[PDB]
Design an enzyme around this catalytic site. Structure first.
Site, PDB file in Angstrom:
ATOM      1  N   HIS A 243      11.452  -8.516  10.883  1.00  9.75           N
ATOM      2  CA  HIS A 243      10.568  -7.524  11.491  1.00  9.75           C
ATOM      3  C   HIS A 243       9.183  -8.069  11.808  1.00  9.75           C
ATOM      4  CE1 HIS A 243      11.364  -6.403   7.203  1.00  9.75           C
ATOM      5  NE2 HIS A 243      10.055  -6.545   7.098  1.00  9.75           N
TER       6      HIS A 243
ATOM      7  N   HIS B 199       0.577 -10.990   7.490  1.00 12.71           N
ATOM      8  CA  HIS B 199       1.478 -10.899   8.616  1.00 12.71           C
ATOM      9  C   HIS B 199       0.745 -10.153   9.729  1.00 12.71           C
ATOM     10  CE1 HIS B 199       1.941  -7.097   6.414  1.00 12.71           C
ATOM     11  NE2 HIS B 199       2.121  -6.574   7.614  1.00 12.71           N
TER      12      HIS B 199
ATOM     13  N   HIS C 230       1.268  -7.448  13.395  1.00 12.27           N
ATOM     14  CA  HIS C 230       2.063  -6.589  14.259  1.00 12.27           C
ATOM     15  C   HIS C 230       1.513  -6.846  15.652  1.00 12.27           C
ATOM     16  CE1 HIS C 230       3.380  -4.221  10.691  1.00 12.27           C
ATOM     17  NE2 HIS C 230       2.213  -4.657  10.247  1.00 12.27           N
TER      18      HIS C 230
ATOM     19  N   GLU D 190      -1.456  -1.395  15.073  1.00 13.10           N
ATOM     20  CA  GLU D 190      -0.981  -0.201  14.397  1.00 13.10           C
ATOM     21  C   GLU D 190      -2.118   0.821  14.310  1.00 13.10           C
ATOM     22  OE1 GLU D 190       1.233  -1.688  10.793  1.00 13.10           O
ATOM     23  OE2 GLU D 190       2.814  -1.044  12.183  1.00 13.10           O
TER      24      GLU D 190
ATOM     25  N   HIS E  84      -2.601  -8.104   8.947  1.00 13.73           N
ATOM     26  CA  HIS E  84      -2.639  -7.451   7.650  1.00 13.73           C
ATOM     27  C   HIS E  84      -2.619  -8.485   6.532  1.00 13.73           C
ATOM     28  CE1 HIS E  84      -0.926  -3.527   9.591  1.00 13.73           C
ATOM     29  NE2 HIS E  84      -2.238  -3.628   9.712  1.00 13.73           N
TER      30      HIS E  84
ATOM     31  N   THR F 155       2.948   0.476   6.305  1.00 14.90           N
ATOM     32  CA  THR F 155       3.321   0.918   7.657  1.00 14.90           C
ATOM     33  C   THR F 155       4.775   0.621   8.038  1.00 14.90           C
ATOM     34  OG1 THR F 155       2.614  -1.145   8.628  1.00 14.90           O
ATOM     35  CG2 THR F 155       0.962   0.657   8.488  1.00 14.90           C
TER      36      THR F 155
HETATM   37  N1  LIG Z   1       2.367  -3.369   7.168  1.00 13.99           N
HETATM   38  S1  LIG Z   1       1.847  -3.281   5.665  1.00 13.99           S
HETATM   39  O1  LIG Z   1       1.587  -1.911   5.318  1.00 13.99           O
HETATM   40  O2  LIG Z   1       0.662  -4.078   5.521  1.00 13.99           O
HETATM   41  C1  LIG Z   1       3.021  -3.856   4.698  1.00 13.99           C
HETATM   42  C2  LIG Z   1       2.735  -4.642   3.571  1.00 13.99           C
HETATM   43  C3  LIG Z   1       3.767  -5.138   2.766  1.00 13.99           C
HETATM   44  C4  LIG Z   1       5.101  -4.847   3.066  1.00 13.99           C
HETATM   45  N2  LIG Z   1       6.176  -5.318   2.276  1.00 13.99           N
HETATM   46  C5  LIG Z   1       6.641  -4.466   1.186  1.00 13.99           C
HETATM   47  C6  LIG Z   1       8.150  -4.666   1.109  1.00 13.99           C
HETATM   48  C7  LIG Z   1       8.536  -6.061   0.617  1.00 13.99           C
HETATM   49  C8  LIG Z   1       7.716  -7.188   1.255  1.00 13.99           C
HETATM   50  S2  LIG Z   1       6.900  -6.644   2.599  1.00 13.99           S
HETATM   51  O3  LIG Z   1       6.014  -7.643   3.153  1.00 13.99           O
HETATM   52  O4  LIG Z   1       7.869  -6.375   3.635  1.00 13.99           O
HETATM   53  C9  LIG Z   1       5.399  -4.073   4.187  1.00 13.99           C
HETATM   54  C10 LIG Z   1       4.366  -3.574   4.990  1.00 13.99           C
HETATM   55 ZN   LIG Z   2       1.537  -4.741   8.323  1.00 19.52          ZN
END
Ligand SMILES: NS(=O)(=O)c1ccc(N2CCCCS2(=O)=O)cc1
Ligand SMILES: [Zn+2]
Ligand SMILES: [Hg+2]
Length: 257
Positions: free
Chosen positions: A61, A91, A93, A103, A116, A195
């Site tokens: 993703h 990471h 988006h 986002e 992020h 998110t």
């Molecule tokens: N997009 S965000 O809110 O910063 C976000 C931060 C961390 C995560 N994760 C939690 C689930 C396991 C690892 S992760 O990176 O996918 C997913 C989304």
């Molecule tokens: Zn994120």
């Protein structure tokens, strides 16, 4: 499983993750005229000098640049935060076009991408436990616009060839996250959520007012990534952003007057 397509995207997530329709979901639109300056906010402290990156992973993703979080080496504190939050990963988006991809939005404006930097509250011992807590996480969000190249991003750009498809990873040691930051640490802050699924409402969001600029060719290489695994039909990794969610009676605070 969940994705960003017509059949498994943001409109579908609520069926497996009921919290999608909860009271503190992210992202949100930042209405700059509704945001209030908060004098009780302490200065924001980003301490990334001892940061220890390990690895980059295409998770189907986005891609995560992962860090060693077994000691206080890269930490976020101050601002709206009590205590110490350790950097675990960052990471992005991004969109299929420069006019979309972020986002968070600012007065409904969409940026080309959003970074992020994900941090977990050290009193909770690890990331897994922190995400069970209302103040378990702090994500520092940084908008990306298209213009001049970001030198500090290029090491990331160049390795993306090596992790084209879902489940691929690459060594990514000695990467310095400080090269991704804008000059100003002026920010908006609000309580929110992850998110992506599981959409847990554990995040203190800290979204910087000043965007970084990245070149057209840097963003173009993001768009060459694949959602799919190797040897599967190619689905370009683009438009991996969730749109703005209802604010519901939360107040966004500004660090600046
Ligand atoms: N997009 S965000 O809110 O910063 C976000 C931060 C961390 C995560 N994760 C939690 C689930 C396991 C690892 S992760 O990176 O996918 C997913 C989304
Ligand atoms: Zn994120
Ligand atoms: Hg939580």
């Amino acid at each position: 499983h969940w994705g960003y397509g017509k059949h498994n995207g943001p409109e579908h997530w609520h069926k497996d993750f009921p919290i999608a329709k909860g009271e503190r979901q992210s992202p949100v639109d930042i209405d700059t005229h509704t945001a209030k300056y908060d004098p009780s906010l302490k200065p924001l402290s980003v301490s990334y000098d001892q940061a220890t990156s390990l690895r980059i992973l295409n998770n189907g993703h986005a891609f995560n640049v992962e860090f060693d979080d077994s000691q206080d080496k890269a930490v976020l504190k101050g601002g709206p935060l009590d205590g110490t939050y350790r950097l675990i990963q960052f990471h992005f988006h991004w969109g299929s076009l420069d006019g979309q991809g972020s986002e968070h939005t600012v007065d409904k404006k969409k940026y080309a991408a959003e970074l992020h930097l994900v941090h977990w509250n050290t009193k909770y011992g690890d990331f897994g436990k922190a995400v069970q807590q209302p103040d378990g996480l702090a994500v520092l969000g940084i908008f990306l616009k298209v213009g001049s190249a970001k030198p500090g991003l290029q090491k990331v750009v160049d390795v993306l060839d090596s992790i084209k498809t879902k489940g691929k990873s690459a060594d990514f040691t000695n990467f310095d996250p400080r090269g991704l930051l804008p000059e100003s640490l002026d920010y908006w802050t609000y309580p929110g959520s992850l998110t992506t699924p599981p959409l847990l409402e554990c995040v203190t969001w800290i979204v910087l007012k000043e965007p970084i600029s990245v070149s057209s060719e840097q963003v173009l290489k993001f768009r060459k990534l694949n959602f799919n695994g190797e040897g599967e039909p190619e689905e370009l990794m683009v438009d991996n952003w969730r749109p703005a969610q209802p604010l519901k009676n939360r107040q966004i605070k500004a660090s600046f007057k």
